[PDB]
Design a protein around this ligand. Structure first.
Ligand SMILES: COCCNc1nc2ccc(C#CC3(O)CCCCC3)cc2n1-c1ccnc(N)n1
Length: 291
């Protein structure tokens, strides 16, 4: 009864019909927790799209799917991966979305060194997106390099809202333990009521990735690392010598243990460091098929 109850709930928010009628040439490009992600062609237009397929009978939290679809059901931002449609195909949920030909940022931080112009460009894009997302009570809860996709001309788009949540004037905070261990904020790990600020911290951790090539305590087990993040002071850049005072000053506004003292997206947009940010063309040489 439980599973069949969820299907019925989906059918009230997903578009009716079988998308297999107009989609062709599926090619897998990703996998992991939720399900598999493929790209496919639309037969009517010849356009390329990306299709995320999530089996309902394989989710640790089946309700997190509903959240994602009803909350992003055609939200529209220049710096967010646009959703086109959602479908219920058998026991699977299909989310049809924009195809980002540039790939994920993870590929860039593990193979090259980004300069501060390129780091500031990424940050600027993420902040502009988060400022609006937070302004409407939406928390990503999984900001990291995997959640940052690129275009061919190097335009940054925030992706993977599989963990996102909605807060309101009535319910201004969340409680559930959600995200990736290494990028988690301390107030979130310590099992405390948290707000949108948990993304600013994770953004901070992602900045470390762009400099060190990996987040703090990445050598440790997930559980042990979380305990370290919980008890310890803010983490230190292994390549502190490589970063400018401007960046270091910027980063110090992100990795503040007290969520109240930690900066917000709207504030950070006015930081002098973001003036270093360059055009989307500057990201281009970093991409795999250019380097
Ligand atoms: C670079 O390729 C890595 C694997 N591809 C991939 N995995 C994804 C997981 C979740 C979402 C996702 C998601 C959303 O949460 C974003 C907001 C709208 C609803 C779906 C998107 C993923 N992608 C995509 C998608 C498009 N292009 C490319 N290159 N990779």
């Amino acid at each position: 009864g439980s599973h069949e109850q969820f299907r019925a709930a989906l059918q009230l928010v997903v578009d009716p019909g079988d998308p297999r009628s107009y989609l062709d040439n599926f090619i897998k490009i990703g996998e992991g927790s939720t399900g598999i992600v493929c790209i496919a062609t639309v037969r009517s237009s010849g356009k390329l799209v990306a299709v995320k397929k999530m089996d309902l009978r394989k989710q640790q939290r089946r309700e997190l799917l509903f959240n994602e679809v009803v909350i992003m059901r055609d939200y529209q931002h220049e710096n967010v991966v646009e959703m086109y449609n959602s479908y219920l195909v058998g026991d699977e949920l299909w989310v049809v979305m924009e195809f980002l030909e540039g790939g994920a940022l993870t590929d860039i931080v593990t193979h090259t060194r980004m300069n501060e112009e390129q780091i500031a460009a990424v940050c600027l894009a993420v902040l502009q997106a988060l400022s609006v997302l937070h302004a409407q009570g939406v928390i990503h809860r999984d900001i990291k390099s995997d959640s940052i996709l690129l275009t061919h001309d190097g335009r940054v788009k925030l992706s993977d809202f599989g963990f996102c949540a909605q807060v309101s004037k009535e319910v201004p905070r969340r409680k559930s333990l959600v995200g990736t261990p290494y990028w988690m904020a301390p107030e979130l790990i310590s099992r405390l009521p948290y707000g949108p600020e948990v993304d600013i911290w994770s953004l901070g951790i992602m900045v470390i990735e762009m400099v060190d090539g990996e987040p703090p305590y990445f050598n440790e087990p997930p559980l042990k690392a979380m305990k370290m993040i919980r008890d310890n002071l803010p983490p230190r850049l292994k390549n502190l010598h490589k970063v400018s005072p401007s960046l270091k000053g910027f980063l110090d506004r992100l990795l503040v243990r007290d969520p109240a003292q930690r900066a917000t997206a709207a504030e950070l947009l006015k930081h002098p460091f973001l003036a270093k940010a360059g055009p989307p063309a500057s990201i281009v040489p970093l991409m795999r098929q250019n380097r």
